[PDB]
Design a protein around this ligand. Structure first.
Ligand code: DKS
Ligand code: MN
Length: 309
């Protein structure tokens, strides 16, 4: 009945020598990590970049997420107007996020086990008797208020001890993003995610089957699920069988907007699924054509970008 957590994805703790070049390190761990779709990378203990976003002016209107919107398809009066719209600052969103989680679980936010949030999230996704609605500060461009990493673009002050992180190859602004093609000779910045408890992203792969790298700057963990690329067709077949028939004929780019599926359903159909809790200061790398999904344990701040090799 209750959710069965998938097996854990690989976690790498590179030494300072191995941490010199990201693409070199990802290329070496590839024989294992590409068989799990996702992997987690813990930087050395003394690698701690500062938070370089413009906090005072950081404002956004998050998207409203109804956890059980797909199950509800199986209409309500005045549908399409369920939730009033709120604009937040970073502070007011965190106050809302902490108040929501502490009130939902009736305990301090840091005392809620990650396994309980995970079990409750997937129960609410399939629940028709309880309509839980959360908000997600998703797809906030790093050009709006700056990246979470320090950037030497002469827009915000950089301290001498912070210049190492502005020049680091693990700075998401310094990842290679230019794909090779003939059209590139004839003729992208990171995105930010401000999460709260139960805010989520559904199953998808990246454009051009690209790699992606994800960094959690601060906050409560982000729970991930990943499927290796050799099982990509198996996942799409399970979707074709069990996803809502009204969305069956939709192209992949549109279907991926609502490809919500319990990982146990995929595992029951023979699809290998791996999980991880990405904590503050840790990287998550997704490999080409590796389907991934997840949700946030609480108030946190993430940065993500697609990169090419
Ligand atoms: O939230 C995280 O941590 C996280 C980690 C990894 N991948 C994702 C992907 C997303 C979301 O956007 C995907 C599509 N957009 C990607 C960025 C873009 F600029 F190209 C514009 C299109 C999303 C997807 C499905 C349902 C809800 C949400 Cl919110 N969130 C992720
Ligand atoms: Mn993604």
């Amino acid at each position: 009945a209750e959710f069965v957590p998938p097996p854990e994805c690989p976690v790498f703790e590179p030494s300072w020598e191995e941490f010199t070049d990201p693409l070199s390190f990802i290329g070496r761990i590839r024989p294992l990590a590409e068989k799990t779709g996702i992997c987690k990378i813990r930087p050395p203990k003394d690698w701690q970049p500062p938070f370089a976003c413009e906090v005072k002016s950081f404002r956004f209107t998050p998207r409203v997420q109804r956890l059980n919107e797909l199950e509800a398809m199986t209409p309500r009066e005045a549908f399409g107007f369920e939730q009033a719209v709120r604009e937040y600052t970073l502070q007011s969103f965190g106050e809302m996020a902490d108040n929501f989680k502490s009130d939902y679980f009736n305990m301090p936010v840091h005392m809620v086990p990650t396994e309980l949030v995970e079990k409750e999230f997937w129960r609410l996704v399939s629940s028709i008797e309880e309509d839980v609605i959360v908000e997600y500060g998703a797809d906030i461009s790093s050009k709006d208020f700056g990246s979470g990493f320090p950037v030497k673009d002469g827009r915000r002050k950089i301290l001498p001890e912070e210049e190492e992180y502005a020049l680091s190859g693990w700075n998401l602004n310094n990842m290679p993003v230019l794909e090779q093609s003939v059209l590139a000779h004839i003729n992208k910045v990171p995105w930010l995610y401000v999460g709260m408890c139960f805010s989520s992203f559904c199953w998808h792969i990246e454009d051009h089957w690209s790699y992606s790298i994800n960094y959690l700057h601060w906050g409560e963990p982000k729970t991930w699920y990943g499927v290796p690329s050799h099982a990509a067709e198996q996942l799409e077949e399970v979707m074709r069988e069990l996803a809502p028939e009204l969305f069956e004929s939709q192209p992949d780019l549109l279907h991926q907007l609502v490809t919500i599926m319990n990982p146990n359903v995929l595992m029951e159909h023979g699809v290998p699924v791996y999980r991880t809790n990405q904590c503050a200061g840790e990287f998550v790398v997704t490999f080409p054509r590796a389907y991934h999904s997840g949700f946030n344990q609480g108030y946190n701040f993430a940065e993500a970008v697609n990169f090419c090799t």
